[PDB]
C-alpha cells in the first residue's frame, strides 16, 4: 500500500555503473514509457579564467547550431522528427545537457548526444550570429532585476575568487572571444571523470549500460589532469554594495551570510529554519492569520510586497538569507522585523513550531520527487555532489535527527554576532548604514 513508513521502502533503487575512461553510469527504473536522458558536467566558471569568463556560457548556445557529423540545424531536425523535447542549461557549478524522450528511440539519443558532447562544428558563421545575440541579450539583461542583484551579491562576498564572477562574463570578452580558446576549454574540462551520465524511466540499469557502451567507452572522455581538481576555498567579505537609482518604483534587497558547503552535516539542520521562518507575497489568500510571523505582519501592514528566503550551498560554501521587495519608505521596517526572527530563533525558539517546519520539509522533499526529469536530475548533481547517494528513506531518518538545541546551536554558529553581506538596488536610500545592521545582528538581550 501507500503508508508513509512503508512508502519509503518500495522504490526502484539507485543504480550505478562505471566505464573505463572516467564516465559514470547510473539509473533508476520508473516503469514508464518515457525516459529523461541527461548529462551533468562540473566544469564551472570557477574553473574558467578571466578570458574564459562567460565562454562556456557562449558555448552553451552553440552545441545545437550543428555539430561535426551533423552540420548546422541538421541536429534538431532529427530530434523533432521523434517528437522528443530537448533542452540544455548551465550553472556556475554545473552544466546539464539532457533529453526527454520515449524509451524507444534512445539508441539514437545518447549516440546523438555523445556526438554533441565532444564532436562540434565550430563555425564563425554561428559564432558571429551567437556573438551578436548574447551582446543583444547582455544589455537586455537589465530588464529582470532579480538576477541582477544576485550578481552584485556574489561579487561582494566572493571578491577575489572566480566564483564571484558573471556567469555570462563581462561583455567585451564575448566580442574578443575566439573558438580556439573554446577548444581549449572544450578539450580541458569535457574529459571524464568530470563527465557524468544518468537517466530514469522504463530503463532499468543494464539495458542502459550496454547501450551506453562505446563512444564514450570511449572517445576520451579521457582521464589525464587539468592539474587537480583546480579549485580554491573562497574568501568571505563583510562589506556592502549599493546601486542607487531612485527613478524606479521599487527597490529589491538581498542580505545573507555564508554557510557550509554541499557536503556537510548541518546543511540539513538549516533546511528547516528557513521553512519555519517561511515567506510572504502580495498575492496569498493566507491573510493575517498565518503562522509565519513574517507572512502575518508583511500581510498585515504590507511592510513588503513579497519576500522569500534562499539557500545555496556551494562545494565548500553555503548561502543563507532572504530577498525582499518593499516600499521606498517601508524598507527599514521590513529589516527591524527580519532581524527579529533570526535572532529570536537562536535563543527563545520552541519545539512546537519545529514540528510545523518539520512536516513541511518532509512534504516539499517528497513533493519534488515526482516526475521523470527531476528524478533523473537529482542523480547528476548528487553524483557530482554526494556521489550516487540518493539516501531517500535516510533523509527521513535525517529529519528525525534535528532538535531544538540543534537548530539553536546551529544558528548560534552561523548567525549570532557575524558579519553579514548587503546587496542593494535603488531607490535604496532609506536603507540604514552598515554600522546599524552590524550592531543589529547581536541582540543586547533585547
Amino acid at each position: 500500500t501507500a503508508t508513509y513508513a512503508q512508502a519509503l521502502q518500495s522504490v526502484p533503487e539507485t543504480q550505478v555503473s562505471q566505464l573505463d575512461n572516467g564516465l559514470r553510469v547510473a539509473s533508476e527504473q520508473s516503469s514508464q514509457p518515457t525516459c529523461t536522458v541527461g548529462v551533468w558536467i562540473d566544469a564551472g566558471s570557477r574553473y574558467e579564467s578571466e578570458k574564459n569568463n562567460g565562454a562556456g556560457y557562449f558555448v552553451e548556445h552553440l552545441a545545437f547550431k550543428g555539430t561535426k557529423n551533423r552540420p548546422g540545424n541538421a541536429l534538431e531536425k532529427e530530434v523533432e522528427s521523434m517528437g522528443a523535447h530537448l533542452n540544455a542549461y548551465s550553472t556556475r557549478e554545473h552544466t546539464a545537457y539532457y533529453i526527454k524522450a520515449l524509451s524507444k528511440d534512445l539508441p539514437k539519443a545518447v549516440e546523438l548526444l555523445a556526438d554533441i558532447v565532444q564532436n562540434c562544428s565550430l563555425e564563425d558563421s554561428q559564432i558571429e550570429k551567437e556573438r551578436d545575440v548574447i551582446l543583444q541579450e547582455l544589455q537586455e539583461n537589465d530588464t529582470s532585476m532579480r538576477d541582477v542583484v544576485f550578481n552584485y551579491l556574489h561579487a561582494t562576498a566572493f571578491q577575489g575568487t572566480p566564483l564571484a564572477q558573471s556567469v555570462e562574463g563581462p561583455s567585451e570578452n564575448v566580442r574578443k572571444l575566439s573558438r580556439a580558446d573554446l577548444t581549449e576549454y572544450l578539450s580541458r574540462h569535457y574529459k571524464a571523470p568530470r563527465m557524468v551520465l544518468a537517466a530514469a524511466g522504463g530503463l532499468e540499469h543494464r539495458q542502459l549500460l550496454d547501450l551506453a557502451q562505446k563512444h564514450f567507452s570511449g572517445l576520451s572522455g579521457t582521464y589525464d589532469e587539468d592539474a587537480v581538481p583546480t579549485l580554491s576555498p573562497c574568501r568571505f567579505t563583510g562589506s556592502q554594495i549599493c546601486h542607487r537609482e531612485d527613478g524606479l518604483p521599487l527597490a529589491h534587497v538581498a542580505i545573507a551570510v555564508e554557510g557550509p558547503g554541499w557536503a556537510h552535516p548541518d546543511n540539513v539542520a538549516l533546511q528547516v529554519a528557513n521553512a519555519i521562518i517561511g515567506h510572504y507575497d502580495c498575492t496569498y489568500g493566507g491573510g493575517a492569520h498565518l503562522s509565519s510571523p513574517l507572512a502575518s505582519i508583511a500581510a498585515t501592514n504590507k511592510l513588503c510586497q513579497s519576500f522569500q528566503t534562499f539557500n545555496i550551498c556551494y562545494a565548500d560554501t553555503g548561502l543563507l538569507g532572504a530577498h525582499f521587495v518593499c516600499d521606498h519608505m517601508s524598507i527599514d521596517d521590513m529589516m527591524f522585523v527580519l532581524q527579529g526572527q533570526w535572532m529570536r530563533l537562536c535563543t527563545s525558539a520552541t519545539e512546537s513550531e519545529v514540528l510545523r517546519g518539520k512536516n513541511l520539509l518532509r512534504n516539499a522533499l517528497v513533493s519534488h520527487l515526482d516526475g521523470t526529469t527531476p528524478v533523473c536530475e537529482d542523480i547528476g548533481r548528487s553524483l557530482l555532489t554526494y556521489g550516487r547517494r540518493i539516501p531517500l528513506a535516510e533523509w527521513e531518518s535525517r529529519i528525525a535527527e534535528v532538535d531544538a538545541r540543534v537548530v539553536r546551536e546551529v544558528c548560534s554558529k552561523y548567525f549570532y554576532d557575524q558579519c553579514p553581506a548587503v546587496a542593494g538596488f535603488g531607490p535604496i536610500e532609506q536603507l540604514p548604514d552598515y554600522n546599524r545592521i552590524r550592531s543589529g545582528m547581536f541582540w543586547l538581550r533585547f
Binding site: 505582519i297 498585515t300 501592514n301 511592510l303 521596517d333
Partner: protein, 55 residues
C-alpha cells in the same frame, strides 16, 4: 510601524529628533561645540547648586 518600541510612549517618537536626524558627511571638529555647550552647562547647574547647599 509594527511593534516599534519607540512608538509606545509617543515621547520616544519625539526622540527621533536625534537618532534618525540626518547630517551631512563632512563635518569638522569645529562643530563639536554645540554639544559641549549644553554639557558645559549641565555641570554648571549641579555644582552651582551644591554651592548653595552650604552657601
Amino acid at each position: 510601524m509594527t511593534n516599534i518600541r519607540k512608538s509606545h510612549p509617543l515621547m520616544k517618537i519625539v526622540n527621533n529628533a536625534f537618532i534618525d536626524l540626518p547630517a551631512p558627511s563632512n563635518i569638522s571638529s569645529w562643530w563639536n561645540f554645540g554639544s559641549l555647550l549644553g554639557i558645559c552647562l549641565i555641570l554648571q547647574i549641579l555644582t552651582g547648586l551644591f554651592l548653595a547647599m552650604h552657601y
